[PDB]
Design a protein around this ligand. Structure first.
Ligand SMILES: Cc1cc2nc3c(=O)[nH]c(=O)nc-3n(C[C@H](O)[C@H](O)[C@H](O)COP(=O)(O)OP(=O)(O)OC[C@H]3O[C@@H](n4cnc5c(N)ncnc54)[C@H](O)[C@@H]3O)c2cc1C
Ligand SMILES: Cc1cc2nc3c(=O)[nH]c(=O)nc-3n(C[C@H](O)[C@H](O)[C@H](O)COP(=O)(O)OP(=O)(O)OC[C@H]3O[C@@H](n4cnc5c(N)ncnc54)[C@H](O)[C@@H]3O)c2cc1C
Ligand SMILES: COc1ccc2[nH]cc(CCNC(C)=O)c2c1
Ligand SMILES: COc1ccc2[nH]cc(CCNC(C)=O)c2c1
Ligand SMILES: [Zn+2]
Ligand SMILES: [Zn+2]
Lengths: 230, 230
């Protein structure tokens, strides 16, 4: 038995609604007997910028810096910065990776975009021919637990923001599926700032309730059809 | 001429293809007599993280930190960190804002995502109400000049990556249109790393050539249909 879960958390305030969702996930998964690790990006002051400091020692081409090539070579030569490799070890061992974050401009907050940019490097998360279905992190599950400022109605086909699946494409398909992750249906907690205490306590309970059978869930068919089709 | 242009540039290497696209933009707009400013994010070591350090005055709610609320109030009070206000001044004066960057996970590099998260704050870029066609940056034009690793064929409805327009949604609609920007058609320079010299020079000249008549262009209809069709 036993499963390992990594929660990559991106919120500045422990008392926030995101903080409560993160804490409920830790509590429930821990109660189930799961091995749980949390990467609290803001508390770690995680570096988001992709720079040459991500490679220790000497570059393979110090004349013209190419981040993708340098990190690919550094990964193979075990020469990546320790913050990056500390994260890859957590991801390598994880059976499920949960990303907990507030939607920032239809996407992840920059600190979490930086985690994706620097941690999921070529050789570790993908390569030729390991991508999408054959991505290097195949066999692992991933799930986006997002909170929004806009209401559910706003995120409908005819709402101003359009369908939620529209902004999910770059994250779910372009990133998670690309690295070989089987993607579980997103958990979207719509406009918690607006909601009442009851509705709030209700979205948290739904999440805690869903986590009870998380290992029984089937991955979504990560296709353009799923995100855009009828 | 008679126009102000801000180029927000996100690439670590001056000698890169992105660097050349940024340089030809400066050269061509400068030749036209336009006023040009470049925010070279990596050279500026631009801070991507949205933290409480972005507000220098008394917080409105020091018990529970809410970045959106605190930055909205700090904007009105003029207590935002100076790096944010320096960027807001550049955007305020610009008639056209060009974003020059390599696609990272179907989106902008984290350093540029941080610029969007921190610079486009409530009160400055939008207000509630006061977004989309009523956004605060209405009247201004925006354009994404993106480079990719994947080829144009990969970026089609039947390609592995799906149509390129799918990944532009969060950026063009969720961010730029949301703030009131008119969005000009994206400049996408496909897979310059695997292209031949003839092809690269060609992509650079195509961009330079396009800039010659940029002021005569009409914005795209930034809608779900334009992005997803059907
Ligand atoms: C830079 C930036 C860009 C943004 N862009 C977007 C965007 O693209 N689209 C969009 O829709 N939104 C956007 N937003 C809004 C953002 O997504 C929401 O503000 C965020 O998701 C709200 O989540 P939170 O955890 O911060 O809420 P909080 O304010 O922390 O919490 C909401 C309420 O829940 C209470 N609460 C906390 N825990 C519990 C609990 N266990 N039970 C009951 N109540 C609890 C809190 O105390 C509070 O009153 C953006 C915000 C910023 C700052
Ligand atoms: C973290 C990360 C995530 C990524 N995710 C994605 C993704 O989601 N999807 C995707 O498609 N790609 C992705 N990529 C790939 C990335 O988008 C490309 O590597 C990038 O767009 C290439 O641009 P460049 O400026 O770095 O090219 P360069 O490495 O500079 O290559 C272009 C070539 O052109 C030459 N050149 C420069 N200027 C000129 C000139 N004036 N005339 C002629 N030739 C010139 C250069 O010397 C070089 O050999 C990712 C890369 C990283 C590092
Ligand atoms: C090096 O870093 C990355 C990271 C994530 C990525 N997604 C897609 C690409 C490029 C794909 N290129 C080709 C020619 O197949 C990519 C590169
Ligand atoms: C969709 O774009 C954004 C961008 C920055 C934002 N800050 C706060 C909010 C939530 C307020 N209501 C809306 C319009 O969702 C927000 C939304
Ligand atoms: Zn997919
Ligand atoms: Zn739009």
């Amino acid at each position: 038995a036993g499963k390992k879960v990594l929660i990559v958390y991106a919120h500045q305030e422990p008392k926030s609604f995101n903080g409560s969702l993160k804490n409920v996930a830790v509590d429930e998964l821990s109660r189930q007997g799961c091995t749980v690790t949390v990467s609290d990006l803001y508390a770690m002051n995680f570096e988001p910028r992709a720079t040459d400091k991500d490679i220790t020692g000497t570059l393979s081409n110090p004349e013209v810096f190419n981040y993708g090539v340098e990190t690919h070579e550094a990964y193979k030569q075990r020469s990546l910065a320790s913050d990056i490799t500390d994260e890859q070890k957590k991801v390598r061992e994880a059976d499920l990776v949960i990303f907990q974050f507030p939607l920032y401009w239809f996407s992840v907050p920059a600190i979490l975009k930086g985690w994706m940019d620097r941690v999921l490097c070529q050789g570790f998360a993908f390569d030729i021919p390991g991508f999408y279905d054959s991505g290097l992190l195949q066999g692992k599950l991933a799930l986006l637990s997002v909170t929004t400022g806009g209401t559910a109605e706003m995120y409908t086909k005819t709402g101003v923001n359009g369908d939620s699946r529209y902004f999910l494409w770059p994250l779910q398909h372009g990133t998670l599926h690309f690295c070989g992750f089987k993607v579980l249906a997103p958990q979207i907690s719509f406009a918690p700032e607006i909601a009442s205490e009851e509705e709030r306590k209700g979205m948290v309970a739904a999440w805690s309730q869903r986590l009870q059978t998380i290992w029984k869930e089937e991955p979504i068919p990560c296709t353009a059809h799923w995100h855009f089709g009828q």
